[PDB]
Amino acid sequence: LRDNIQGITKPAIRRLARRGGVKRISGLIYEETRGVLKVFLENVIRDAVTYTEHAKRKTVTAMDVVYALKRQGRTLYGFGG
Amino acid sequence: VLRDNIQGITKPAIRRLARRGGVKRISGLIYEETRGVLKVFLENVIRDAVTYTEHAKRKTVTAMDVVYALKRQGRTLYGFGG
Amino acid sequence: HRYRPGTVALREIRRYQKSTELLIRKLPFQRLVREIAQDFKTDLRFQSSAVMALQEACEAYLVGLFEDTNLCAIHAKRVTIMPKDIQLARRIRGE
Amino acid sequence: RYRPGTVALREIRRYQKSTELLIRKLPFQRLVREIAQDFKTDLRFQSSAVMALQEACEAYLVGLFEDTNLCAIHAKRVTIMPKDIQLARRIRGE
Amino acid sequence: VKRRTHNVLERQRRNELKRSFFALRDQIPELENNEKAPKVVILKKATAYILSVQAEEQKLISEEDLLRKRREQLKHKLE
Amino acid sequence: SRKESYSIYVYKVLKQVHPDTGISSKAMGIMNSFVNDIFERIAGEASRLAHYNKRSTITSREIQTAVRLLLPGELAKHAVSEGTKAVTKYTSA
Amino acid sequence: RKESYSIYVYKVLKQVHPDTGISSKAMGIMNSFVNDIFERIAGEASRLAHYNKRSTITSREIQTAVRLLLPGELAKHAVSEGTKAVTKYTSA
Amino acid sequence: DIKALQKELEQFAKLLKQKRITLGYTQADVGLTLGVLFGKVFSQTTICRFEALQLSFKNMCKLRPLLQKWVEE
Amino acid sequence: GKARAKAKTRSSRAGLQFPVGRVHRLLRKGNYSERVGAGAPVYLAAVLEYLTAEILELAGNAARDNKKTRIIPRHLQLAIRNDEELNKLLGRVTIAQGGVLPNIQAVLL
Amino acid sequence: KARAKAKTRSSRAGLQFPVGRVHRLLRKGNYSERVGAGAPVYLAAVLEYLTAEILELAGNAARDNKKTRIIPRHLQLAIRNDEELNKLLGRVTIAQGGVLPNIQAVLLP
Amino acid sequence: DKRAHHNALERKRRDHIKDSFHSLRDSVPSLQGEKASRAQILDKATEYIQYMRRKNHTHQQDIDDLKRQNALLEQQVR
DNA sequence: CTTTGTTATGCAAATCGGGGTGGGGCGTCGTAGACAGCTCTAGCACCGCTTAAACGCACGTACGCGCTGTCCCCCGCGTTTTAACCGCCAAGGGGATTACTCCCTAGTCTCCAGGCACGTGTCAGAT
DNA sequence: ATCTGACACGTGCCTGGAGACTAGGGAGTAATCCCCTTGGCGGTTAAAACGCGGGGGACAGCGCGTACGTGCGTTTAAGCGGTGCTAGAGCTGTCTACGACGCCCCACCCCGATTTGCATAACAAAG
């Protein structure tokens, strides 16, 4: 897979900004936002994969994501744990 | 019975801290705001340090009680123990 | 008839704050997650619940960032958010 | 007389280079005892416990001032205001 | 045999320690000529010597710090 | 294969507080994770206290201390009172 | 009597910088450092064992904890050094 | 005979519907009235499904006795 | 507390709804300590129940305010974020499908 | 490493850090019921590596300041001028460490 | 009598040496607060004196250098 | 148009029962800590003297703040197009489980040496 | 004459570690089955993409005006060194109340049907 960051469209970014209470978005936000999201995903996925490899499992489970997030100080409820 | 020792933190002391932080100019309202922030910070650290001390049935607060009080808040301190 | 600019923006802010559904479509999100995962290790599989967990955290993360970004723009006496406001919020947060 | 800001920059370099505590020890001790007194009376402190508090407190305030300074710059100002401190604390989540 | 081994190892350990005493003794100017200096004197005077030398360091660093401050003030005057 | 949860106890508490109110399965999953998180936090803090005091047995004193540290303000005050009450009644004849 | 790593720090420093000393305050800091890293890894290894329903901590849990705790090059080098030390110990 | 039982339940359900309409009651009112009589306060959904024969024969047999009292009352 | 209990269950003796026996078991399996005092799981169970009740009460009120008879994740989010003590305790927690508070600033109007 | 000739476990592993001590420390604190034989060896190697890395940088900082002894200032510089260590120890306060001499361009003439 | 007295004299001799070792041990930062053998204390004291000798020499060099720099700056100032 | 109750029904949730297990007594036993006592460390209160730092005030001016004006570029809306989603299908692989088996660490005991000090011989300078 | 202190020899002596087995438990390995992930296909329609015209806000520049910085003289209390006092930190010894652990039995919890309401929407009337 290549360049699926484009899967995050402007409207999707705008809608997230709307929950944040933003009325106006500059044209440079969309590119900056995608860069930030990519980094966030890499940090969570890298750890979730590390857990998965350690366990000798071929598949990533919700608990691997939860542990990956827990270590970053971001506790998640409702997905198990 | 101690009262109003927050005034022990003088303007120069605040100015010097701000200067270490790279601040070039300081508003006159900073001094009061700074004291308010420091008081809150101390209350949170001391409250935990005292709680640790009381749990151990001790009357003296030790450096390790402060270290644990700080470590607990995500602010690990080196050189006073581990 | 046409609405004055900003009328809709307020409508959308209220509407999206009231609602709880995901804003990012699942299929392209999955493709993004898989692309990244393939860099760390190849031939990985994911449970559908793992993907949902990732998206939920991501949206909550980005919204929280936008809230702080908005505060920075307000502090700067602006309405429009710029990359400077995002970068400042992240720098203060400690990311 | 030096142009204003000339001295401030000298002081910034001076204090960034040095490592000693900027807050006077006795005034600080009284403040710590005053606060501790509200949780339990007749408490005693190790002299090293006080030093531990000073070190954490100054490090905390200095880090806060650095973030405060960034807020002021973002606002296109040199002078730091309570508005900048409150924003920095709001973002940090204090 | 084990007793003999212990005897000689301890005998040598004493001699090795004596050599360490001499190495320290020879390094202290106060004991330079005192070839028969006893263990207790070497340790006591070594302690006193090191402490006086450490006190000298504190005096020297104080002068260095004052001179650095003077250097900065003189450069400031030239500016 | 059996999966344990606290959903039955969460349900009973709600039944006593708001007898006419039901709870969604998603809300229940959240409440279940909440209980597990608080349990870990207190048990973890109690473990640290026992270690810091070089003690090997955890008692109500360590837990009470952990509660005072973990919960803020009035919430802590009430939790301590309830904990004290439960133990006092439990050991009382 | 209290335990510390100051004797080992002295030896490591001698091997890296044969003509550099260390202050007592700096030494106190290095001891705080070692104890902090130890706790982080030991704690993380404990969590990993718990998550996988294991009761024994081995080099695999520690290696994993290192990958999780250390950033960048430090994780890469620490793992290589750890693996090397165990390999030598096993054959020693 | 399951078919004979089905017919009996269908006949009651038809009579029940006729009684409800004749008395001017809603399906919700029937369930509320059963709550008064037995303590079991049924929703309109259960009553609707009973009349619509969407319930199993076993369920209709178990609820019928309560509905029979409703018809008498 | 309760004047008396007849049930053998330790949870009943303590006047609690939460399972004391399970809390005791978990404390022993989590290796938090070599030994766990008998009163330890009793105190802890009481705390877990208390906190549980506080959230459910607020969430139940939120459900009533929204004219709903069932608690949903949205209500839990509102229950926590509108309560200072709970918001501090769970401030870093993300609640699935919880949404956000309807916070509108004057500068937006 | 190339060879081993020792009875001491630390020497067999080629480490300066005490393997036997680490082994005891792993048992302490109830980290696990059991500890693998190679566990303390792997960990000791990691602790030594990181220790050496900081000391090397701090020693270089000492030379830059024409000092023959490492002081807390040097440790602070060694960490804050190194991205990997700064991330690892970014939350750590170092006694008498001081701060980096960073001044913003907007404040300068 | 004499043998028992000799034992007492020998005990006192050893006690003075043991205390003197401790005082010397605490004088060298490499052993301060640490366990050390008799030989280690002597060896560290020996190298530490050599260190302090060259350290104090180095300090004097820096003093002489700063004095000379100050003299040059003073000459420019006057 | 806008407002409102009646009944329909898809589907998530509350309830029932049957059976499997882990909670709770009960007794036994080893030890963790509760408690008393004692030493002596360092924390606190006080004092006097020195002197650097803190305080108050005069005096300019560098920078914050309010206003004007211009012009970029973001919003809202209409119209086209493009993948997301939904429903359905099958393939297989990997995750969970159960049953062996072997090897590896907690546990206990053995013992070796490396610094350490008690006790004895002695040897020259000092009372 | 003998006293004091010194080096040096005989030999126990504490502890710290590693070495050697040893049983019982955990973890590794192999087999098997079935749920759940991946992948594909067609239809449809909600959302994304794109163009454009207008107006609102970003931003540069200008002028005040006052709040903040900088000296300078004077006051205050921080800091340092020294004295004395005792509360309580920290250690050790005794001994018992208490929690681990083994074993047994049944009332309570899990999960699979199974019943039954909740929220939303189709189907009419009323001002």
Q: Name the pairing type of β-strands J93-94 and B77-78.
A: parallel
List the alpha helices (DSSP H) in D1-94.
6-17, 25-36, 47-74, 82-92
Cα D64–D67–D70 angle (5° rounding)? Answer: 150
Element of type H or E holding I35: strand I35-36
* DSSP string computed for F7-41: HHHHHHHHHHH-TT-EE-HHHHHHHHHHHHHHHHH
Taking the C-alpha atoms of residue A1 and residue C34, their distance in angstroms, rounded to an integer, is: 7
H49 annotated as a binding-site residue: no
List the alpha helices (DSSP H) in chain H.
2-23, 27-38, 44-51, 57-72
Long-range contacts of C44-49 (CB under 8 A, 24+ apart): C44/A49, C44/A52, C44/A58, C44/A59, C44/A60, C45/A58, C45/A59, C45/A60, C46/A59, C46/A60, C47/A59, C47/A60, C47/A61, C47/A62, C49/A61, C49/A62, C49/A79, C49/A80
User: Do the Cβ atoms of B81 and G29 come closer than 8 Å?
Assistant: no
- DSSP label at residue E29: G
Reading the block at residue A47, the tokens are: 């750890």
Instruction: Verify whether the Cβ–Cβ distance K29 to G21 is below 8 Å.
Output: yes
- DSSP label at residue A1: -
User: Do the Cβ atoms of J10 and J20 come closer than 8 Å?
Assistant: yes
Taking the C-alpha atoms of residue F39 and residue F10, their distance in angstroms, rounded to an integer, is: 14
Taking the C-alpha atoms of residue D32 and residue D55, their distance in angstroms, rounded to an integer, is: 13
Domain count, chain B: 1
J10-28 burial, b at 16+ Cβ within 10 Å, e below that, comes to: bebbbbbbbbebbbebbee
Size of chain B, expressed as the number of residues it contains: 82
Residue of E nearest to K75 (CA): E74
Taking the C-alpha atoms of residue I57 and residue J21, their distance in angstroms, rounded to an integer, is: 52
Taking the C-alpha atoms of residue I32 and residue F42, their distance in angstroms, rounded to an integer, is: 10
Residue I105 touches partner A, C-beta closer than 8 Å: yes
User: Do the Cβ atoms of K75 and E77 come closer than 8 Å?
Assistant: no
Q: Which residues contact K73 (CB under 8 A, 6 or more apart)?
A: E71, E74, E75, E77, E78
3-state secondary structure of K26: coil
Taking the C-alpha atoms of residue A8 and residue C32, their distance in angstroms, rounded to an integer, is: 9
Assign 3-state DSSP to chain C and report helix, strand, coil percentages, each to 5: 70, 5, 25
Domain count, chain K: 1
The chain B residues in contact with chain J (CB within 8 A) are 20-22, 24, 70, 74-80
Looking at chain H, after which residues does the C atom sit over 2.5 Å from the next written N, breaking the chain?
none
Closest by CA to H29, choosing from A20, B13, H19, is: H19
User: Do the Cβ atoms of J79 and J73 come closer than 8 Å?
Assistant: no
User: Do the Cβ atoms of G57 and J26 come closer than 8 Å?
Assistant: yes
User: Do the Cβ atoms of K73 and E71 come closer than 8 Å?
Assistant: yes
- DSSP label at residue D2: P
Estimate the crossing angle of helix F73-91 against helix F60-70, to 10 degrees: 160
Instruction: Verify whether the Cβ–Cβ distance F58 to I10 is below 8 Å.
Output: no
Domain count, chain E: 1
Range(s) of the domain holding residue J86? 8-109
Place of tokens 């360590």: F62
Q: How was this structure determined?
A: cryo-EM
Residue of D nearest to C64 (CA): D91
H27 annotated as a binding-site residue: yes
Q: G-chain residues within 8 Å CB-CB of B80?
A: 28, 32
Instruction: Verify whether the Cβ–Cβ distance D67 to C93 is below 8 Å.
Output: no
Closest by CA to J97, choosing from G25, D19, G33, is: D19
Q: Which residues contact I39 (CB under 8 A, 6 or more apart)?
A: F59, F60, F87, F90, F91
- DSSP label at residue C1: -
Reading the block at residue F92, the tokens are: 């009382």
Q: Name the pairing type of β-strands J34-35 and G21-22.
A: unpaired
φ and ψ at C46, to 5 degrees?
-130, 140
Reading the block at residue A77, the tokens are: 């409820």
Taking the C-alpha atoms of residue J10 and residue J44, their distance in angstroms, rounded to an integer, is: 9
Element of type H or E holding C34: helix C26-40
Tell me how far CA of residue D90 lies from CA of C12, C71, D61, D84, D94, in angstroms. 25, 9, 15, 10, 6
Look up residue G27 and give its amino acid: M
Reading the block at residue A72, the tokens are: 């970053």
Closest by CA to H27, choosing from H41, H12, H11, H47, is: H47
Domain segments of chain F: what residues?
Answer: 1-93
Closest by CA to G46, choosing from J30, A73, A46, J37, is: J30
Number of H helices, E strands in chain K: 2, 0
Taking the C-alpha atoms of residue H70 and residue H40, their distance in angstroms, rounded to an integer, is: 12
Range(s) of the domain holding residue B11? 3-82
Q: Report the phi/psi class of residue K39: left, alpha or beta, with left for phi > 0 and alpha for psi in -120 to 50.
A: alpha
Report CA A29 to chain centroid distance, whole Å: 17
Element of type H or E holding D45: strand D44-45
Taking the C-alpha atoms of residue G7 and residue G11, their distance in angstroms, rounded to an integer, is: 7
3-state secondary structure of E73: helix
Place of tokens 């017919």: H7
Closest by CA to J90, choosing from D23, J98, J82, A25, is: J82
Radius of gyration of chain C (CA): 17
| Nearest CA-CA distance, residue C77 and chain A, Å | 13
Closest by CA to A66, choosing from G71, I22, I31, F37, is: F37
Taking the C-alpha atoms of residue C55 and residue C51, their distance in angstroms, rounded to an integer, is: 6
User: Do the Cβ atoms of B31 and B11 come closer than 8 Å?
Assistant: yes
Mutation choice for C interface testing from D87, D90, D94 by most C CBs within 10 A: D87
Residue B20 touches partner F, C-beta closer than 8 Å: no
Place of tokens 């604190």: J29
Q: G-chain residues within 8 Å CB-CB of K29?
A: 21, 23-24
Q: Report the phi/psi class of residue J96: left, alpha or beta, with left for phi > 0 and alpha for psi in -120 to 50.
A: left
Taking the C-alpha atoms of residue I83 and residue I81, their distance in angstroms, rounded to an integer, is: 5
**Which subunits count as partners of chain J given 3+ CB pairs below 8 Å?**
B, D, G, I
Mutation choice for D interface testing from C92, C93, C95 by most D CBs within 10 A: C92
Range(s) of the domain holding residue K33? 1-78
Give the residue nearest to nucleotide L121 (CA to C1'): K3
Reading the block at residue F21, the tokens are: 């109110």
In chain C the first and final C-alpha atoms are separated, in Å, by 46
Closest by CA to E30, choosing from E51, E52, E45, is: E45
J49 forms beta bridges with none
CATH topology of domain G1-92: Histone, subunit A (1.10.20)
User: Do the Cβ atoms of K42 and E24 come closer than 8 Å?
Assistant: yes
Range(s) of the domain holding residue E19? 1-79
Q: What is the largest CA-CA distance in chain B?
A: 48
Closest by CA to D88, choosing from C17, G45, B34, is: B34
- Give a yes or no: residue J1 inside a domain: no
Element of type H or E holding B78: strand B77-78
Tell me how far CA of residue A74 lies from CA of A65, I94, K12, in angstroms. 11, 7, 66
Tell me how far CA of residue A22 lies from CA of C2, C16, E36, F10, I106, in angstroms. 21, 11, 89, 38, 12
CATH topology of domain F1-93: Histone, subunit A (1.10.20)
Q: B-chain residues within 8 Å CB-CB of D78?
A: 24-25
* DSSP string computed for G6-75: HHHHHHHHHHH-TT-EE-HHHHHHHHHHHHHHHHHHHHHHHHHHHHTT--EE-HHHHHHHHHHHS-HHHH
Mutation choice for A interface testing from G40, G44, G51 by most A CBs within 10 A: G51
Q: What is the largest CA-CA distance in chain D?
A: 52
Size of chain C, expressed as the number of residues it contains: 95
Residues of chain E (37-56) having a beta carbon less than 7 angstroms from strand M: 38-41
Q: J-chain residues within 8 Å CB-CB of I32?
A: 30
Q: How far does the CA of K25 sit from the C1' of L120, in Å? A: 30
Residues of chain H (36-55) having a beta carbon less than 7 angstroms from strand M: 40-43, 45-46, 49, 55
Q: How far does the CA of H14 sit from the C1' of L95, in Å? A: 54
J35 forms beta bridges with G57
Taking the C-alpha atoms of residue K26 and residue A17, their distance in angstroms, rounded to an integer, is: 64
Taking the C-alpha atoms of residue F91 and residue I53, their distance in angstroms, rounded to an integer, is: 24
User: Do the Cβ atoms of C23 and A17 come closer than 8 Å?
Assistant: no
* DSSP string computed for K32-68: TTS---HHHHHHHHHHHHHHHHHHHHHHHHHHHHHHH
CATH number at residue I26: 1.10.20.10
Taking the C-alpha atoms of residue B81 and residue B63, their distance in angstroms, rounded to an integer, is: 8
Taking the C-alpha atoms of residue E4 and residue J100, their distance in angstroms, rounded to an integer, is: 63
**Which subunits count as partners of chain A given 3+ CB pairs below 8 Å?**
C, F, G, I
Place of tokens 């039901």: F22
Reading the block at residue J34, the tokens are: 């059991």
Taking the C-alpha atoms of residue I31 and residue I28, their distance in angstroms, rounded to an integer, is: 6
Q: How far does the CA of A62 sit from the C1' of M39, in Å? A: 22
Half-sphere exposure of A13 (CA within 13 A, CB side): 21
Residues of chain J (47-86) having a beta carbon less than 7 angstroms from strand M: none
User: Do the Cβ atoms of G57 and J35 come closer than 8 Å?
Assistant: yes
Domain count, chain J: 1
Residue C88 touches partner D, C-beta closer than 8 Å: yes
Reading the block at residue E34, the tokens are: 């005192």
Number of CB pairs < 8 Å for B and J? 26
